[PDB]
Design a protein around this ligand. Structure first.
Ligand SMILES: O=c1ccn([C@H]2C[C@H](O)[C@@H](COP(=O)(O)NP(=O)(O)OP(=O)(O)O)O2)c(=O)[nH]1
Ligand SMILES: O=c1ccn([C@H]2C[C@H](O)[C@@H](COP(=O)(O)NP(=O)(O)OP(=O)(O)O)O2)c(=O)[nH]1
Ligand SMILES: O=c1ccn([C@H]2C[C@H](O)[C@@H](COP(=O)(O)NP(=O)(O)OP(=O)(O)O)O2)c(=O)[nH]1
Ligand SMILES: [Mg+2]
Ligand SMILES: [Mg+2]
Ligand SMILES: [Mg+2]
Lengths: 144, 144, 144
């Protein structure tokens, strides 16, 4: 069997429409089979002094399906090696959002600046279902 | 059709009981259709110097259903604009928890204090299913 | 009925194989019924000055099932009390990963060092399903 056939056990897996606003970057991909996230690239060069943060363009936009959420998580390697984090982690991408995904990077190292270059992988994007809960206000939890 | 009718495609959507311990705040709501989270308010005024953190009352309590988790995520706007983050993000709200949701806000800006006023939206609350996994200890992964 | 019988409503609950690389630590457990996470221990003593971070061994390895993700979240108590956080939170554990779970702890307090002792609970591990999305590149979202 070739690629185009959806294997049985992946019949149900979901699709995510994506637009490369920056066509010069590779499409986000999973580094390994079963990996939770696809790796987002930086569209830009940016240098972050200790304690500084930046809102960095990834060059993509996505259409998260209704009933789901996209989540932007930090890469573990850079987090440890150089103290790179994401201010609003986990970044919450709503089903209705059709703008460019931007990553609020922050340098949590005390002394060493972090240089990010265009084309570097700077975060990962997961997609999960979410319960769009209906609030039921009660006067006490007994009542419910 | 009017509001009270549960549309077909939302027959299965879950309910979340909530108690406004602070009845003076609006109920948390989704800013847009399909948004992953409902926006939590601060019950209080608080001022956070750079690097400082506070445990801020939201004026609500919830009953996350068994088999699910509530998750407190930072708002992207404040995160970028002013460096506001959440120390324990993502905040983990257990199914059994019936206390007030409190938000561990922290100012990650190097120089500018953040002022939060009562009634400001300071986080978002998502609800997701969680696998309540049964651990199976093995001596090596082959064995399993 | 005794323990070994899987109750009806937990017929479907998933298993997580785990190896204690450090057999001297307790197995991670849920502190209460319905808790989202199991509590990870530190295998080691470590002292974190303000602003410093460390990659701390938990003494376990796990096999997250294909179609799921493990997620390492900070404990709320330590986060508030002493400013302890996790640089890459939420830590993303892929289905394929068979190495030791390590926690990138960071001291976000301005002045007081944090001492972690072997055997202390330093994070929690959740397991959730994840959508292993198939990207569909489009030239505009209309097109899709
Ligand atoms: O908190 C964590 C996160 C990850 N890990 C392990 C499990 C995970 O599958 C593996 C890779 O993690 P990330 O994808 O978060 N980091 P990065 O993208 O830098 O490394 P890789 O190229 O291996 O994916 O590291 C941990 O032990 N603790
Ligand atoms: O890391 C992120 C997070 C969000 N976003 C986009 C997608 C999301 O749907 C939109 C709104 O995000 P938040 O709800 O996290 N922030 P805030 O509540 O300040 O803005 P809004 O009023 O638009 O919801 O911003 C990103 O590009 N990157
Ligand atoms: O952001 C949060 C996180 C938790 N909480 C409440 C709900 C949760 O079920 C309870 C315990 O949270 P954690 O497990 O995250 N922290 P810790 O492990 O220190 O406390 P406990 O021993 O109670 O689990 O604290 C909040 O109000 N806000
Ligand atoms: Mg990775
Ligand atoms: Mg929002
Ligand atoms: Mg706990």
């Amino acid at each position: 069997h070739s690629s185009g056939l959806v294997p049985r056990g992946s019949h149900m897996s979901t699709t995510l429409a994506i637009v490369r606003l920056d066509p010069g970057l590779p499409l986000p991909s999973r580094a390994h089979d079963g990996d939770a996230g696809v790796n987002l690239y930086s569209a830009e060069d940016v240098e972050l002094a200790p304690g500084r943060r930046a809102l960095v363009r990834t060059g993509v936009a996505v259409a998260v399906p209704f009933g789901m959420v996209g989540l932007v998580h930090p890469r573990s390697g850079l987090a440890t090696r150089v103290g790179l984090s994401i201010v609003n982690s986990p970044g919450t991408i709503d089903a209705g959002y059709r703008g460019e995904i931007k990553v609020a990077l922050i340098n949590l190292d005390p002394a060493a600046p972090i240089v990010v270059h265009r084309g570097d992988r700077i975060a990962q994007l997961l997609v999960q279902r979410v319960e769009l809960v209906e609030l039921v206000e009660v006067s006490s939890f007994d009542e419910a």
